Design a protein around this ligand. Structure first.
Ligand SMILES: O=C(O)[C@H]1O[C@@H](O[C@H]2[C@H](O)[C@H](O)[C@H](O[C@H]3[C@H](O)[C@H](O)[C@H](O[C@H]4[C@H](O)[C@H](O)[C@H](O)O[C@@H]4C(=O)O)O[C@@H]3C(=O)O)O[C@@H]2C(=O)O)[C@@H](O)[C@@H](O)[C@@H]1O
Ligand code: CA
Ligand code: CA
Ligand code: CA
Ligand code: CA
Ligand code: CA
Ligand code: CA
Ligand code: CA
Length: 480
């Protein structure tokens, strides 16, 4: 059954406190078993409760609020409110609220004329307890001028959808997804917020972030992170399309997350790296357009690195693992470092640094002068049985342009492959060129690298750095 707020005494005049009248329509719609609460165009002033957890308006199960449009219907916090208010619209703490939503309206937190932390839209059940809100929809909603978090769906919410919405000029993050599950953020814009455009945090998993745009935020365009507590990391985070540009830090930052994907985005004009990946297990970075980042200083368009939390709350060291970096256009340097397991690392037009770490990795530099680093003799090797897997291959080594950094391995130079030298060998059919250590170590292992193609004639000693002195002289990058 459909309910109009004006029928409950709501004025929408910008001056009268309409909180009770709008909540009356909510409660009547909830008592009918569900329905739509409609708000014609106008500015409805609203106030909070006794506690921050009271929010301002309590949406209920099977209740949807439909305004007359963003800008047309504005729900604005009263002048002078001085109490922390957790959700101008919110579901009840300790209730699994379900099948509710808001559409075509503006939430205005009025931070210029209020004091206290205010969040726009708050969802969820109980922090650190099992249970969830579910089937939650925000469609064409604008949240602005809240002092902290604009869209703040919270622990836990399953099947939250926020689409075609905007968060701007909020004091902290425009969108936070806090322990969101099986949820969708699609075709949203988050801009000119105090800190992050989008912030996916607190164990959120199976999240689609499709065709979102974040610009002009004080910190990240999008950050996906564990957060500050020792809890399960987020995982299964798929970032598809959109644009993360002109933000105060990295365009996209992903850290302490498993199975994350960033594909087909445009990423530019950010003050820090365009993309930064710290301690991510399973990272796919495909077909993105990355340019003109590090505007605030910095040497890298793309940064892959570990996340050392040993001095932090978990006590753990988190490696970036299982990385696939292909198809990107990158107008600047990519630092692509990974660890145990098979990595596929493709640089682009910049002067890139590539290191797949342990395991059988396939590396390519693309354009420019690229350094392929092998930090450990066990990072590319063939074993006693002749198991040729675990041997890295470099797809496109360019003699006179690229560099093989062996400076930490203690080989003296090219030679016959014994006594600390490496042999340069062509395989039987002349399809691959090998650098080989013919001397087995105590475990029977042989350091070996495959260079795809025939380079036995074009490769020279000046294409390999065999010690730190040679690396300082020959290094192609500004990232070592
Ligand atoms: O980033 C961070 O610093 C951490 O943020 C964490 O999320 C916070 C939320 O932002 C809210 O402030 C949320 O407030 C909860 C309270 O935790 C509490 O459960 C409260 O419960 C009330 C209940 O509503 C009712 O009034 C009853 O009568 O008394 C209860 C009581 O006061 O104990 O309701 C508040 C609410 O729902 O607004 O709390 C969480 C939190 O985790 O504490 C979180 O993301 C954390 O991981 C971050 O580190
Ligand atoms: Ca709830
Ligand atoms: Ca203020
Ligand atoms: Ca390159
Ligand atoms: Ca590897
Ligand atoms: Ca190259
Ligand atoms: Ca190693
Ligand atoms: Ca390797």
């Amino acid at each position: 059954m459909d309910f109009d707020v004006k029928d409950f005494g709501a004025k929408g005049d910008g001056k009268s406190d309409d909180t009770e009248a709008i909540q009356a329509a909510i409660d009547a719609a909830y008592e009918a078993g569900g329905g739509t609460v409609r708000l014609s165009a106008g500015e409805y002033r609203v106030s909070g409760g006794d506690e921050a957890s009271d929010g301002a308006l309590m949406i209920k199960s099977n209740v949807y609020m439909d305004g007359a449009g963003m800008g047309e219907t504005v729900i604005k916090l009263v002048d002078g409110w001085d109490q922390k208010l957790t959700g101008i619209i919110r579901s009840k703490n300790g209730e699994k609220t379900h099948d509710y939503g808001i559409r075509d309206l503006t939430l205005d937190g009025n931070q210029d004329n209020t004091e206290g932390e205010v969040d726009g839209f708050y969802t969820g059940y109980i922090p650190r307890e099992d249970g969830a809100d579910y089937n939650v929809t925000a469609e064409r909603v604008e949240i602005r001028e809240v002092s902290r978090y604009g869209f703040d769906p919270h622990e836990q919410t399953i099947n939250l959808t926020i689409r075609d919405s905007v968060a701007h000029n909020n004091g902290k993050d425009g969108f936070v997804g806090d322990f969101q599950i099986d949820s969708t953020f699609e075709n949203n814009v988050s801009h000119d917020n105090g800190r992050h455009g989008f912030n996916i945090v607190t164990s959120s998993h199976d999240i689609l972030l499709r065709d979102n745009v974040a610009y002009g935020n004080g910190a990240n365009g999008l950050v996906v992170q564990r957060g500050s507590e020792d809890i399960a990391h987020p995982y299964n985070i798929q970032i598809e399309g959109g644009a993360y540009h002109d933000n105060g830090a990295e365009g996209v930052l992903i850290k302490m997350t498993s199975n994350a994907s960033l594909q087909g985005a445009e990423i530019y004009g950010n003050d820090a790296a365009g993309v930064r990946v710290r301690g991510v297990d399973g990272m796919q970075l495909l077909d993105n357009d990355i340019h003109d980042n590090a505007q605030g200083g910095g040497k890298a368009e793309i940064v892959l690195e570990d996340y050392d939390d040993r001095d932090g709350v978990s006590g753990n060291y988190y490696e970036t693992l299982n990385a696939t970096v292909q198809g990107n256009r990158v107008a600047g340097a990519a630092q692509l470092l990974s660890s145990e397991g098979r990595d596929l690392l493709d640089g682009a037009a910049g002067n890139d640094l590539l290191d797949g770490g342990a395991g059988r990795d396939t590396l390519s530099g693309g354009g420019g002068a690229d350094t392929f680093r092998f930090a450990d003799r066990q990072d590319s090797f063939r074993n006693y049985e002749g198991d040729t897997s675990r041997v890295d291959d470099i797809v496109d080594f360019t003699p006179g342009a690229d560099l093989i950094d062996l400076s930490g391995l203690g080989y003296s130079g090219l030679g016959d492959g014994y006594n600390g030298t490496l042999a340069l060998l062509l395989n039987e059919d002349g399809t691959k060129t090998y650098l080989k250590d013919r001397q087995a170590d105590a475990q029977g292992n042989h350091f070996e690298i495959a260079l795809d193609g025939n380079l036995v004639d074009s490769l020279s000693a000046t294409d390999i750095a065999f010690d730190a002195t040679q690396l300082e002289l020959l290094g192609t990058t500004d990232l070592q």
